Design an enzyme around this catalytic site. Structure first.
Site, PDB file in Angstrom:
ATOM      1  N   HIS A  62       0.840  -1.196   0.000  1.00  0.00           N
ATOM      2  CA  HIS A  62       0.000   0.000   0.000  1.00  0.00           C
ATOM      3  C   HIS A  62       0.875   1.246   0.000  1.00  0.00           C
ATOM      4  CE1 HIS A  62      -3.210  -2.773   0.773  1.00  0.00           C
ATOM      5  NE2 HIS A  62      -2.530  -3.251   1.799  1.00  0.00           N
ATOM      6  N   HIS A  92       5.624   6.876   6.809  1.00  0.00           N
ATOM      7  CA  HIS A  92       5.401   6.458   5.436  1.00  0.00           C
ATOM      8  C   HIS A  92       4.831   7.652   4.699  1.00  0.00           C
ATOM      9  CE1 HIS A  92       1.564   5.991   7.562  1.00  0.00           C
ATOM     10  NE2 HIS A  92       1.033   6.393   6.420  1.00  0.00           N
ATOM     11  N   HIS A  94       2.172   9.031   1.182  1.00  0.00           N
ATOM     12  CA  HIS A  94       1.056   8.807   0.272  1.00  0.00           C
ATOM     13  C   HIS A  94       1.431   9.751  -0.858  1.00  0.00           C
ATOM     14  CE1 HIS A  94      -1.512   6.745   3.226  1.00  0.00           C
ATOM     15  NE2 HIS A  94      -0.886   7.527   4.086  1.00  0.00           N
ATOM     16  N   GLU A 104      -3.280  13.450   1.196  1.00  0.00           N
ATOM     17  CA  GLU A 104      -4.559  12.986   1.701  1.00  0.00           C
ATOM     18  C   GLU A 104      -5.288  14.204   2.239  1.00  0.00           C
ATOM     19  OE1 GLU A 104      -3.591   9.360   4.132  1.00  0.00           O
ATOM     20  OE2 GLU A 104      -4.419   8.508   2.282  1.00  0.00           O
ATOM     21  N   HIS A 117       3.571  10.842   6.806  1.00  0.00           N
ATOM     22  CA  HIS A 117       2.878  10.536   8.053  1.00  0.00           C
ATOM     23  C   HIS A 117       3.824   9.893   9.047  1.00  0.00           C
ATOM     24  CE1 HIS A 117      -1.336  10.313   5.974  1.00  0.00           C
ATOM     25  NE2 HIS A 117      -0.949  11.552   6.221  1.00  0.00           N
ATOM     26  N   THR A 196      -6.061   6.582   7.909  1.00  0.00           N
ATOM     27  CA  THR A 196      -6.584   6.854   6.574  1.00  0.00           C
ATOM     28  C   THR A 196      -6.655   5.628   5.667  1.00  0.00           C
ATOM     29  OG1 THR A 196      -4.457   7.446   5.581  1.00  0.00           O
ATOM     30  CG2 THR A 196      -5.663   9.187   6.743  1.00  0.00           C
TER      31      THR A 196
HETATM   32  C1  COX Z   1      -2.713  -0.650   8.233  1.00  0.00           C
HETATM   33  C2  COX Z   1      -2.161  -0.440   9.634  1.00  0.00           C
HETATM   34  O1  COX Z   1      -1.965  -1.555  10.418  1.00  0.00           O
HETATM   35  N1  COX Z   1      -1.495  -1.140  11.559  1.00  0.00           N
HETATM   36  C3  COX Z   1      -1.343   0.229  11.636  1.00  0.00           C
HETATM   37  C4  COX Z   1      -0.789   0.885  12.799  1.00  0.00           C
HETATM   38  C5  COX Z   1       0.550   0.598  13.232  1.00  0.00           C
HETATM   39  C6  COX Z   1       1.114   1.234  14.363  1.00  0.00           C
HETATM   40  C7  COX Z   1       0.350   2.179  15.092  1.00  0.00           C
HETATM   41  C8  COX Z   1      -0.975   2.487  14.697  1.00  0.00           C
HETATM   42  C9  COX Z   1      -1.540   1.851  13.566  1.00  0.00           C
HETATM   43  C10 COX Z   1      -1.792   0.742  10.356  1.00  0.00           C
HETATM   44  C11 COX Z   1      -1.873   2.118   9.900  1.00  0.00           C
HETATM   45  C12 COX Z   1      -2.990   2.601   9.128  1.00  0.00           C
HETATM   46  C13 COX Z   1      -3.072   3.948   8.699  1.00  0.00           C
HETATM   47  C14 COX Z   1      -2.036   4.851   9.039  1.00  0.00           C
HETATM   48  S1  COX Z   1      -2.155   6.521   8.539  1.00  0.00           S
HETATM   49  N2  COX Z   1      -2.194   6.594   6.840  1.00  0.00           N
HETATM   50  O2  COX Z   1      -0.857   7.252   9.062  1.00  0.00           O
HETATM   51  O3  COX Z   1      -3.549   7.008   9.078  1.00  0.00           O
HETATM   52  C15 COX Z   1      -0.909   4.429   9.797  1.00  0.00           C
HETATM   53  C16 COX Z   1      -0.836   3.078  10.217  1.00  0.00           C
HETATM   54 ZN    ZN Z   2      -0.665   7.488   6.121  1.00  0.00          ZN
END
Ligand code: COX
Ligand code: ZN
EC number: 4.2.1.1
Length: 257
Positions: A62, A92, A94, A104, A117, A196
């Site tokens: 992703h 990471h 987007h 986003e 993020h 997200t």
């Molecule tokens: C998929 C997933 O599976 N686990 C997590 C995760 C990992 C560590 C802390 C909090 C969420 C996530 C995750 C999902 C979304 C995001 S985001 N784009 O930063 O809101 C960041 C992490």
């Molecule tokens: Zn993110």
């Protein structure tokens, strides 16, 4: 049939497996700068990444995550709208298939080329797993990326992407300093939101910096060379892995400035 960013498994389909997708505090959202209000109750934001210790970089199909050792209180985010200490676990991005899209969150409907993020979990909950079961379990620091001058601090990330081209691949990635990805100003907007991507859990306090960082066209072009697919499968370029703005609902965006 797993979720993704395509026409048959994209953002508009997520609600079927994850009904919270139509929840009351979903992210991202458009940040209407004129409606956002300065909040004097906000304390100074503290980003302490001096002892941050990265460990690995992974293509999860992703996006790609730069992971950190969060077994000790090292890289932490505090202050601002936060109550307590939040520990950095990974970061990471987007991004889009073109420079005019990719972020986003949007600012007055403007889309940036990408969005960084930095994910943190509230230490009062012991582990991130327990944290994602709390309304204030996470804090994500979002930083916009625009295309212009190169960001020197990002090159080390760009140069390792060839080693994790496909889904499932990971590579050692130690001693990376996330401080090199931060803009000069810490002015920000904040609001209660969610992850997200599925599971879209509503446990995030979002802190989105107003000042974007500049990255070069060549740097983002390399992001676009990654694959959503695993090794040995038809190539599907990892681009436009962003969720669009969601309804603000009963929320107010606060400004630190
Ligand atoms: C998929 C997933 O599976 N686990 C997590 C995760 C990992 C560590 C802390 C909090 C969420 C996530 C995750 C999902 C979304 C995001 S985001 N784009 O930063 O809101 C960041 C992490
Ligand atoms: Zn993110």
């Amino acid at each position: 049939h797993h979720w993704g960013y395509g026409k048959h498994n994209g953002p508009e389909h997520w609600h079927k497996d994850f009904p919270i997708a139509k929840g009351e505090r979903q992210s991202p959202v458009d940040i209407d700068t004129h409606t956002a209000k300065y909040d004097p109750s906000l304390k100074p934001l503290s980003v302490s990444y001096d002892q941050a210790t990265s460990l690995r970089i992974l293509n999860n199909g992703h996006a790609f995550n730069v992971e950190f050792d969060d077994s000790q209180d090292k890289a932490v985010l505090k202050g601002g709208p936060l109550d307590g200490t939040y520990r950095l676990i990974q970061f990471h991005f987007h991004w889009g298939s073109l420079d005019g899209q990719g972020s986003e969150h949007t600012v007055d409907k403007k889309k940036y080329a990408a969005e960084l993020h930095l994910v943190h979990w509230n230490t009062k909950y012991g582990d991130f797993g327990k944290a994602v079961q709390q309304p204030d379990g996470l804090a994500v620091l979002g930083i916009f990326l625009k295309v212009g001058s190169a960001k020197p601090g990002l090159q080390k990330v760009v140069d390792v992407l060839d080693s994790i081209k496909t889904k499932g691949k990971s590579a050692d990635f130690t001693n990376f300093d996330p401080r090199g990805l931060l803009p000069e100003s810490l002015d920000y907007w904040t609001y209660p939101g969610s992850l997200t991507t599925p599971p879209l859990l509503e446990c995030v306090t979002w802190i989105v910096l107003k000042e974007p960082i500049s990255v070069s066209s060549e740097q983002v072009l390399k992001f676009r060379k990654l694959n959503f697919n695993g090794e040995g499968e038809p190539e599907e370029l990892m681009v436009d892995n962003w969720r669009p703005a969601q309804p603000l609902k009963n929320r107010q965006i606060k400004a630190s400035f």
